[PDB]
Amino acid sequence: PFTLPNLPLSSLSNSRAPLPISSMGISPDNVQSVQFQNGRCTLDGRLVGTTPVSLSHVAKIRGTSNGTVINLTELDGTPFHPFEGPAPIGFPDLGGCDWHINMTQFGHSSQTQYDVDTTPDTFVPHLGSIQANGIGSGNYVGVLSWISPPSHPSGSQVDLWKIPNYGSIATHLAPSVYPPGFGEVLVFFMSKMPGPGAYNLPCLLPQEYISHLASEQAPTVGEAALLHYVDPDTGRNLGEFKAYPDGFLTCVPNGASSGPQQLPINGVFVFVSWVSRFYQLKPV
Amino acid sequence: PFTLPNLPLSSLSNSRAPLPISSMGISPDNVQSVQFQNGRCTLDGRLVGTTPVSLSHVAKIRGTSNGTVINLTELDGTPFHPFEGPAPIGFPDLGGCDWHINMTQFGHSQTQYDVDTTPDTFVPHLGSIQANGIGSGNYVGVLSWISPPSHPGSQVDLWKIPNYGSITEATHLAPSVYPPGFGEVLVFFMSKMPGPGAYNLPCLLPQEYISHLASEQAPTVGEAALLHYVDPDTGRNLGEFKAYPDGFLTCVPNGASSGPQQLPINGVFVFVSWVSRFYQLKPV
Ligand SMILES: CC(=O)N[C@H]1[C@@H](O[C@@H]2[C@@H](O)[C@@H](CO)O[C@@H](O)[C@@H]2O[C@@H]2O[C@@H](C)[C@@H](O)[C@@H](O)[C@@H]2O)O[C@H](CO)[C@H](O)[C@@H]1O
Ligand SMILES: CC(=O)N[C@H]1[C@@H](O[C@H]2[C@@H](O)[C@@H](CO)O[C@@H](O)[C@@H]2O[C@@H]2O[C@@H](C)[C@@H](O)[C@@H](O)[C@@H]2O)O[C@H](CO)[C@H](O)[C@@H]1O
Structure with missing residues (x-):
């Protein structure tokens, strides 16, 4: 049963x-x-x-940084829309802390640490965007690495x-x-x-x-x-x-x-x- | 059924x-x-x-480094012994490539560990792999990308x-x-x-x-x-x-x-x- x-x-x-x-x-x-x-x-x-x-x-994100903002999508790469939910499927949901996501790229070498502060008004995953904190242009897939x-x-x-x-x-x-x-x-x-x-x-x-x-x-x-x-x-x-x-x-x-x-x-x-x-x- | x-x-x-x-x-x-x-x-x-x-x-490693080698344990921290297998449970199994594992620590604020699986110092079966510049300390690592x-x-x-x-061994x-x-x-x-x-x-x-x-x-x-x-x-x-x-x-x-x-x-x-x-x- x-x-x-x-x-x-x-x-x-x-x-x-x-x-x-x-x-x-x-x-x-x-x-x-x-x-x-x-x-x-x-x-x-x-x-x-x-x-x-x-x-x-789980605890992953995907999107394209233009140098100031990262436009989110499903981990799939298929578009995400506000009516679907608070954020893309799988988006980290750890409040009360700063995040440090490890960012990688299909087709490119190396990784970059992505510092995320979820309190500013530039942090709006529901609307499909979050502040790029120095992450340069490109497509990335990141996973939560450690918090603070x-x-x-x-x-x-x-x-x-x-x-x-x-x-x-x-x-x-x-x-x-x-x-x-x-x-x-x-x-x-x-x-x-x-x-x-x-x-x-x-x-x-x-x-x-x-x-x-x-x-x-x-x-x-x-x-x-x-x-x-x-x-x-x-x-x-x-x-x-x-x-x-x-x-x-x-x-x-x-x-x-x-x-x-x-x-x-x-x-x-x-x-x-x-x-x-x-x-x-x-x-x- | x-x-x-x-x-x-x-x-x-x-x-x-x-x-x-x-x-x-x-x-x-x-x-x-x-x-x-x-x-x-x-x-x-x-x-x-x-x-x-x-x-x-999956594709994770755990061990203590002394700056020269990394003595591995199970993700658990519990000891590993040759008789248990080719490597601790979950140890990355991707041959034909170099690895790049994201290293983090419990209690400290990530380091990229570049791994060549080809040398003599790479003997995870003996619970020991070369610390390619990874400073002293305990770490938990996860495979990020390959090259x-x-x-x-x-x-x-x-x-x-x-x-x-x-x-052959x-x-x-x-x-x-x-x-x-x-x-x-x-x-x-x-x-x-x-x-x-x-x-x-x-x-x-x-x-x-x-x-x-x-x-x-x-x-x-x-x-x-x-x-x-x-x-x-x-x-x-x-x-x-x-x-x-x-x-x-x-x-x-x-x-x-x-x-x-x-x-x-x-x-x-x-x-x-x-x-x-x-x-x-x-x-x-
Ligand atoms: C990278 C990191 O660990 N960030 C944490 C850290 O705060 C950082 C860190 O470099 C510490 C090291 O002593 O100095 C803080 O001032 C710094 O704060 C962060 O960067 C500065 C420039 C400002 O943007 C701050 O608003 C920002 O938090 O520890 C922080 C809490 O003290 C926080 O967890 C950061 O994520
Ligand atoms: C961090 C990284 O990308 N490592 C891969 C890369 O390593 C080589 C390059 O980084 C190259 C860039 O000019 O510099 C080389 O020094 C480096 O070689 C690496 O270290 C030397 C001492 C040798 O042990 C090499 O075998 C080793 O790769 O590219 C290589 C492949 O060419 C590997 O994918 C590295 O993982």
């Missing part, structure tokens, strides 16, 4: 950058809902936001739970994700992101979970999916979790000892059955 | 580099066999060579693999893949690779196929699976293919100028049924 990848978490990838998943976590005290644009897929198999099927499209603290919210710290400013504060943003409540906490898959700090990138689903869900457009019954996080070596059930139709998991923490982050990351999520949205999970 | 990802080839990735698939093709006449180390998975879900589950490990081999006006031949050991490489004959030919998924030329990187299975077969762990009945490359738009069968146990596809080209090379990239492969190894395919 409905299925999730029968693969160990630590072997999967983040969905907002091509990084391996290192642990599971929760949002900080000051984050209730999130609105990531990448790593968004319904249990139905419907890609949301700028989420691509393949990790080979924001240049203009002067002195501010890296905050990856945020999303960048796509439009020039209606960019057709994917709806934001809200915790169901009543004891249930949203689970995030974390990864370490290169840069001058101990940066941790969260995402709602592992990228392979997305390609798998988009592949298995399973007629998802039930308002919520009861899953077991199991150790593939012992078959031991390490705790119950829930998967909602919008494409996110939750669980119930155990007060102090905590929950998700305590669990080892070599486990596998297994679909046990369709339950009601109001089903109660045993702690973890 | 065995399956293949119900996703368009054009939205999937190459398995030897994190690059989108741009087309399908055949090996040049001067290539009778292939021995790629990444992108190897049996229909059984058995990963071979240095093949990883996630694209987040002609430093040794011997040699051409860029992406159908070869690098010399992992110090030519048991580096525990994955076995070779041979065209079963019978008019059948090996099918490759190609991706355009950055560099000073029109480079096309071939692989035996998109990366999305690997994570899927490894997840399915489906018992390989029959000697080969009969496949139909279907157009999702019109639902029409665009040609018959066969998938074999070791993890490769084949087809009978209906002439030199006719083959998978001329089919549209947005089709989906669909398992129709298990047939005899000898089953003759209709030309494509």
Whole structure:
């Protein structure tokens, strides 16, 4: 029926950058809902936001610099239009930080580091343009390399739970994700992101979970999916979790000892059955 | 019951580099066999060579440099040992060319690592490669672009693999893949690779196929699976293919100028049924 990848978490990838998943976590005290644009897929198999099927499209950009601006296109080279979304499919969605994209060219040698500040009004990927920060004329394909603290919210710290400013504060943003409540906490898959700090990138689903869900457009019954996080070596059930139709998991923490982050990351999520949205999970 | 990802080839990735698939093709006449180390998975879900589950490990290296050599570890940081294989999981497998990997660090603010896979200092199988000017420190690197081999006006031949050991030496490489004959030919998924030329990187299975077969762990009945490359738009069968146990596809080209090379990239492969190894395919 409905299925999730029968693969160990630590072997999967983040969905907002091509990084391996290192642990599971929760949002900080000051984050209730999130609105990531990448790593968004319904249990139905419907890609949301700028989420691509393949990790080979994640946190990447493509376009032509005329010396002052870079006109964006799909990674494909086919045109991008505002009505389609906040930015081209795959566009980085890491807010609260400056980006450093590695730029390459088909037909040309070498690479160039592209420093991106997502706060000026020259940064408008929704309208198909972003400031060329010294990147000279030519066609480029870039991938997020490493990040750093924001240049203009002067002195501010890296905050990856945020999303960048796509439009020039209606960019057709994917709806934001809200915790169901009543004891249930949203689970995030974390990864370490290169840069001058101990940066941790969260995402709602592992990228392979997305390609798998988009592949298995399973007629998802039930308002919520009861899953077991199991150790593939012992078959031991390490705790119950829930998967909602919008494409996110939750669980119930155990007060102090905590929950998700305590669990080892070599486990596998297994679909046990369709339950009601109001089903109660045993702690973890 | 065995399956293949119900996703368009054009939205999937190459398995030897994190690059989108741009087309399908055949090996040049001067290539009778292939021995790629990444992108190897049996229909059984058995990963071979240095093949990883996630694209987040593809064509990446990890190790500590002392300015002279780089002692490699798994992307993980966990140690590597000769007995484990030709190189750590995910180590770039592109022979016939020089590499240019983008090096980054956790905790520091990228460096281009120019790699000649030809010298004596290049022994990733012994977990050690020359630091071509790369300063001391720990780094995570990913292949960015390629260029002609430093040794011997040699051409860029992406159908070869690098010399992992110090030519002939048991580096525990994955076995070779041979065209079963019978008019059948090996099918490759190609991706355009950055560099000073029109480079096309071939692989035996998109990366999305690997994570899927490894997840399915489906018992390989029959000697080969009969496949139909279907157009999702019109639902029409665009040609018959066969998938074999070791993890490769084949087809009978209906002439030199006719083959998978001329089919549209947005089709989906669909398992129709298990047939005899000898089953003759209709030309494509
Ligand atoms: C390349 C880089 O690491 N940029 C970061 C860096 O800020 C840069 C950097 O060169 C540091 C080195 O000491 O000096 C800063 O002044 C510089 O700021 C950046 O460039 C200057 C000329 C102005 O354009 C600034 O607005 C811009 O941020 O660290 C920054 C935060 O301190 C930020 O992460 C940059 O991306
Ligand atoms: C950075 C780069 O583009 N490297 C490729 C390039 O290397 C050669 C050129 O950069 C050339 C430009 O005038 O300068 C040469 O010094 C350089 O040669 C490289 O280093 C020397 C010492 C030898 O070891 C060469 O084998 C080596 O390539 O072009 C070569 C091919 O000619 C390679 O693709 C380099 O990766």
